[PDB]
C-alpha cells in the first residue's frame, strides 16, 4: 500500500529517475567494477573527460574525487536565447532538456563551485524561466477539453506538480460528457 501519493509521482521520485541519466565527468583518480548497469569504466584518467551515470558522479563529488562538467544547455548566455525564444512564442513551451528543473536543483547543491559564473546568475535565470513558463501553463490550461491537450515540451517536475489536478478534473469533465451521449 504505497499510501502517498499515490497516483502521481513523488517529487523525490523524479530525481530518483533523472539521476539515471548519464553526464560527462572530470575524474581526479587514475576492482573492477562491473556493478550491473554501468558498463563503465576502464580506470578513469585524470584530466580526461568521460561519460558516466549521474548518481555516481554525485557520489564521487561528495568525496570531491571528481569534477562534474556543466551541461552545454546550462549557462546564462545560453538560457538567454531560450527565454528570448519563449517570450516570442506564447503558445509553445520551446525546447527543454525535460529534466532541467531537477538538474537545476541537484547540480547547484554541490557542484556549484565547478560552474563558470554560477553565482547569483543562473539561479536568477532558471527561477525566471520557471516563472513565465509556469504562468504560460496556467493560461494555456484554460483551453482544456476532452480528450486532447498539447503540453508539448514540458519538464517532468512540471508534469508531476499539476498532474493530479488536470488528470482529476479531466476525470470529472470527460466523465459527464462521455456519459451524456
Amino acid at each position: 500500500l504505497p499510501a502517498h501519493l499515490q497516483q502521481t509521482f513523488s517529487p523525490e521520485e523524479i530525481q530518483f529517475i533523472v539521476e539515471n541519466e548519464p553526464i560527462k565527468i572530470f575524474p581526479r583518480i587514475t576492482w573492477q567494477l562491473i556493478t550491473t548497469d554501468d558498463k563503465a569504466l576502464n580506470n578513469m584518467v585524470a584530466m580526461r573527460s568521460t561519460e558516466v551515470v549521474l548518481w555516481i558522479a554525485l557520489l564521487l563529488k561528495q568525496q570531491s574525487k571528481c569534477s562534474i562538467v556543466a551541461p552545454q544547455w546550462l549557462t546564462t548566455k545560453e538560457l538567454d536565447r531560450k527565454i528570448q525564444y519563449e517570450k516570442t512564442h506564447p503558445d509553445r513551451f520551446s525546447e527543454l532538456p525535460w529534466n532541467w528543473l531537477v538538474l537545476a536543483r541537484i547540480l547547484f547543491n554541490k557542484a556549484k563551485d565547478d560552474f563558470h559564473d554560477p553565482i547569483h546568475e543562473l539561479r536568477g535565470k532558471i527561477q525566471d524561466l520557471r516563472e513565465i513558463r509556469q504562468i504560460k501553463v496556467l493560461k494555456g490550461l484554460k483551453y482544456l477539453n476532452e480528450s486532447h491537450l498539447q503540453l508539448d515540451n514540458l519538464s517532468l517536475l512540471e508534469i508531476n506538480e499539476l498532474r493530479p489536478f488536470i488528470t482529476e478534473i479531466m476525470d470529472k469533465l470527460r466523465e459527464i460528457h462521455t456519459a451524456s451521449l
Binding site: 499515490q6 486532447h148 491537450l149 479531466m170 476525470d171
Partner: protein, 221 residues
C-alpha cells in the same frame, strides 16, 4: 539481453505501472533474471568485503558505489511490486470475475506473479472471512454473492480504460504506423476525430485508445 536494457525496461515498467489506472501483465522473463542477478551480487559484495580484511595487516569506493547501486535497484522493484499488490487489493473482485470467465486471458501464471497469486487468493479469502463474521450473519439472500446486481454495481469497477494518463511518445521509426505529417500513431478515438499523434510531444488522453501503443512500448507514460 544486456543488463542496462533489462534495467531500462525495469524503469519503463515501473513508470507505466504507477501511471496506468489498471494492472499490467507480470513480466517474469526479466524480473526473474534480476531476482537471480541481485542474489548473485549481494553475495558477491559480502564475499569481496570479507576478503578485503585479509590484506589488512585501501579504497572503499567501488564497494560503496556497488552497495549504493544495489540499494537503488532493490528499491525500484520493491516500489513496483508494492504497488501492484495494492492494485490487486483494489481489483481483487474484478480479477475474480475475470478468472471465472473463459475469455480472454485469466490470471494464470502470467498475469500475476507466482508470489502474487498467493497474496491475491489469501487476501481475498481472509477478506471475505472478515466481512463474513462481521456484517453477514445477518445475511441478505440476494446479496450472498459478491458481484454485479447490477447496480450499483459492484466491482466490476474499476477496469477504467477512459482515465487520463500523461503520455510521452517514443519509438523506432522505419524512416510501421507513420502516416505523416510528423509521425505515428493512430488514435481513432470513438467519440472524436483523430488529432492524431506527434512523437516529440506528450499528449494526454484516455488509457483505452493508447493501450495497444502501450503493449508495443511505442509511447512512454
Amino acid at each position: 539481453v544486456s543488463p542496462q536494457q533489462d534495467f531500462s525496461d525495469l524503469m519503463k515498467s515501473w513508470k507505466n505501472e504507477r501511471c496506468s489506472p489498471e494492472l499490467l501483465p507480470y513480466p517474469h522473463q526479466l524480473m526473474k533474471r534480476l531476482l537471480n542477478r541481485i542474489s548473485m551480487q549481494s553475495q558477491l559484495i559480502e564475499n569481496i568485503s570479507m576478503g578485503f580484511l585479509d590484506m589488512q595487516n585501501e579504497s572503499k569506493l567501488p564497494l560503496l558505489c556497488m552497495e549504493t547501486e544495489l540499494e537503488r535497484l532493490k528499491f525500484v522493484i520493491r516500489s513496483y511490486i508494492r504497488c501492484r499488490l495494492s492494485k490487486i487489493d483494489k481489483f481483487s473482485l474484478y480479477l475474480r470475475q475475470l478468472n471465472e470467465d473463459e475469455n480472454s486471458l485469466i490470471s494464470l501464471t502470467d498475469l500475476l506473479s507466482k508470489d502474487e497469486i498467493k497474496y491475491h487468493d489469501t487476501h481475498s479469502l481472509i477478506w471475505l472471512k472478515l466481512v463474513n463474521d462481521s456484517i453477514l450473519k445477518y445475511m441478505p439472500e440476494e446479496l450472498q454473492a459478491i458481484n454485479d446486481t447490477e447496480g450499483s454495481v459492484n466491482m466490476i469497477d474499476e477496469p477504467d480504460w477512459n482515465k487520463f494518463v500523461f503520455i510521452h511518445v517514443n519509438g523506432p521509426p522505419d524512416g510501421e504506423n507513420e502516416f505523416g505529417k510528423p509521425c505515428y500513431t493512430v488514435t481513432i478515438p470513438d467519440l472524436k476525430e483523430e488529432v492524431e499523434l506527434t512523437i516529440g510531444s506528450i499528449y494526454v488522453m484516455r488509457y483505452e485508445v493508447i493501450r495497444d501503443l502501450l503493449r508495443d512500448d511505442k509511447v512512454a507514460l
